[PDB]
Amino acid sequence: VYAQEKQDFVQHFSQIVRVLTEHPEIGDAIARLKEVLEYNAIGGKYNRGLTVVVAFRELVEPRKQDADSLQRAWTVGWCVELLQAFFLVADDIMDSSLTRRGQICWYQKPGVGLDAINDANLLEACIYRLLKLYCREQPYYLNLIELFLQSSYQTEIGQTLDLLTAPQGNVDLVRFTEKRYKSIVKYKAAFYSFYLPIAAAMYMAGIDGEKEHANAKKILLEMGEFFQIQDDYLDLFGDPSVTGKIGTDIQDNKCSWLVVQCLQRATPEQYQILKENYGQKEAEKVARVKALYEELDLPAVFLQYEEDSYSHIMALIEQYAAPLPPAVFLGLARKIYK
Amino acid sequence: VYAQEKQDFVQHFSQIVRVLTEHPEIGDAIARLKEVLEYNAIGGKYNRGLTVVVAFRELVEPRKQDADSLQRAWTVGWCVELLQAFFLVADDIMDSSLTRRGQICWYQKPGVGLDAINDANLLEACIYRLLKLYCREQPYYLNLIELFLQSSYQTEIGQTLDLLTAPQGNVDLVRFTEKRYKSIVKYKAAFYSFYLPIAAAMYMAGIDGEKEHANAKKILLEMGEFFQIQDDYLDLFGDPSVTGKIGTDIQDNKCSWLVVQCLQRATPEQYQILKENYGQKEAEKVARVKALYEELDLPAVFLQYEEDSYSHIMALIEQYAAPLPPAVFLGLARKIYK
Ligand SMILES: O=P(O)(O)C(O)(Cn1ccnc1)P(=O)(O)O
Ligand SMILES: O=P(O)(O)C(O)(Cn1ccnc1)P(=O)(O)O
Ligand SMILES: [Mg+2]
Ligand SMILES: [Mg+2]
Ligand SMILES: [Mg+2]
Ligand SMILES: [Mg+2]
Ligand SMILES: [Mg+2]
Ligand SMILES: [Mg+2]
């Protein structure tokens, strides 16, 4: 029955596009912006954006949840979707990806190519444009600007670490450690994916306390780590008709949770098979790596990890949710661990 | 004797790098950030960054120009250099450029490639990192954040217009009009190049009035337009040992001031020579376009335009400089029209 809360959020995208596309000299650039927005911020699950709206309603007194306050909540929710769209458009280029959300990657579109770099930058610019148009006169205005900027910097540090640990055509198996893996996922996914939308609803509700944001981070950073580990598992073992994207981690020589777990269980012979076949474009070599992972029962190791993680996150909710409603984190835990 | 004001600004870059590179888990990403900063924000003329410092000293009472206020002025000056570095790293990729500031473009460096997209994003992130570390407790903090964000959005709209008017392998001569040209340069260069550093010094001096910023824009936007027209002229007729970069406008099918002026003077036969030779990679075809421009006396047309522009900008300074010191704009006019 949660498809209704989604439907309302999706319906507000038309308003977001209209407001951002409203100078006859910039008309052609405005039309390109509309195309970028429609192609990239639509076709997703909108869970990150929806988390702003859902948490806003659960943290703000209903008497203060007026039409304009709710409008501001939907807008900031769409700002989170725009931040994600900015990072994914650029990430698809850098990871040489083919598809995203059941369609070809925006940069792979004939006539787009590397112009997608500027398109990604425009998506980022739209966030601060919406924050100014809707939240400029709000006491949480600077809190939100700083939150989106800090989330961007943390994601970009994470992306730097992801790209450095994955050099094209260079055997970096020794660098694929558990400590290295935890550092990457913390920065590249955990902050913008779960802390950002909840923290935004918190600042909008007047919850600006350092300790409250610290406690919320304790739960959400661990949820973010799980989500990235699940993303790494699905890169190879997920159904592309469900994920909407084709995996590239093995070909891209990425420090995937799968390769880290492989190296913790591989014999010296299995290690050599991995060394000779990892980080290469040949379909035959990728297939050999997948066979190795299946031989080492990594899908069963992931299933066990998912159960241990769920139990750990629920224990963190019991420890750190107060004084916030547990439903804020429980709703998020249900969607991610389904 | 103005080389001394430059030397001091350059000496402060070591502090900027140290502060931005100071978590052992992010160590490798921090080392990559230092490399990106050193490669891209050094080797330039630093005129945009220096304009912050010079205008700060000319707008703030010397009694308020303490060591910490001056430190904040140098930092915001380096923030302007970082914004420019962010845009140029991404612009070199999208324009398929070879060199910048006498060295190969960062993305052309072996082992960098499209990872430069994230490097460019990190340079942008460093701006807001420095603004928070040095200007967070200042009354102009939000004014500066909004100024850098708005300057980014205007530049990105300009870049969109530049890339749309220049499609790869598509004859777009009819689109190369004077109105189209003025629209592109206004957004892609004029705002971040001259309005941004002066407006920053103004906000730092407590000059936040809408009319004062409007009047300053009247002069600086026209200075920005001239600088972009000069950039277009130098793309083909400039000495690469002086400019530090190799021209790509003809090959890239750009709506250059040169091609716009060509079309205003070309006969139907000269138009066909331009049509058959513009926007193509062949050295022979680029050479034919350059011969056409030289035949149509475009270098003499530019020299005349430079004189008319200088006189127009000085007339704008007389009309709109007050109540600011004219030296603020005169110093900038001397550096650009030299
Ligand atoms: O595996 P990635 O980290 O590249 C990914 O999760 C994207 N991403 C990029 C930064 N954080 C997440 P996706 O698999 O969607 O391509
Ligand atoms: O000619 P462009 O507009 O690409 C240039 O001026 C860069 N640029 C990009 C946006 N504004 C200016 P450069 O000749 O340095 O490559
Ligand atoms: Mg990816
Ligand atoms: Mg990636
Ligand atoms: Mg992935
Ligand atoms: Mg260029
Ligand atoms: Mg360009
Ligand atoms: Mg140029």
Swiss-Prot record, chains A, B:
Dimethylallyl diphosphate binds at residues 100, 188-189, 228, 245, 254. The modification N6-(2-hydroxyisobutyryl)lysine is found at residue 45. GO terms for biological process: cholesterol biosynthetic process; farnesyl diphosphate biosynthetic process; geranyl diphosphate biosynthetic process. GO terms for cellular component: cytoplasm; cytosol; mitochondrial matrix; nucleoplasm; peroxisome. The keyword Cell division does not apply. Mg(2+) 2 binds at residues 91, 95. Inactivated by interferon-induced RSAD2. This inactivation may result of disruption of lipid rafts at the plasma membrane, and thus have an antiviral effect since many enveloped viruses need lipid rafts to bud efficiently out of the cell. It comes from the Eukaryota. Its cofactor is Mg(2+). Binds 2 Mg(2+) ions per subunit. Mg(2+) 1 binds at residues 91, 95. It is linked to Porokeratosis 9, multiple types: A form of porokeratosis, a disorder of faulty keratinization characterized by one or more atrophic patches surrounded by a distinctive hyperkeratotic ridgelike border called the cornoid lamella. The keratotic lesions can progress to overt cutaneous neoplasms, typically squamous cell carcinomas. Multiple clinical variants of porokeratosis are recognized, including porokeratosis of Mibelli, linear porokeratosis, disseminated superficial actinic porokeratosis, palmoplantar porokeratosis, and punctate porokeratosis. This is Farnesyl pyrophosphate synthase.
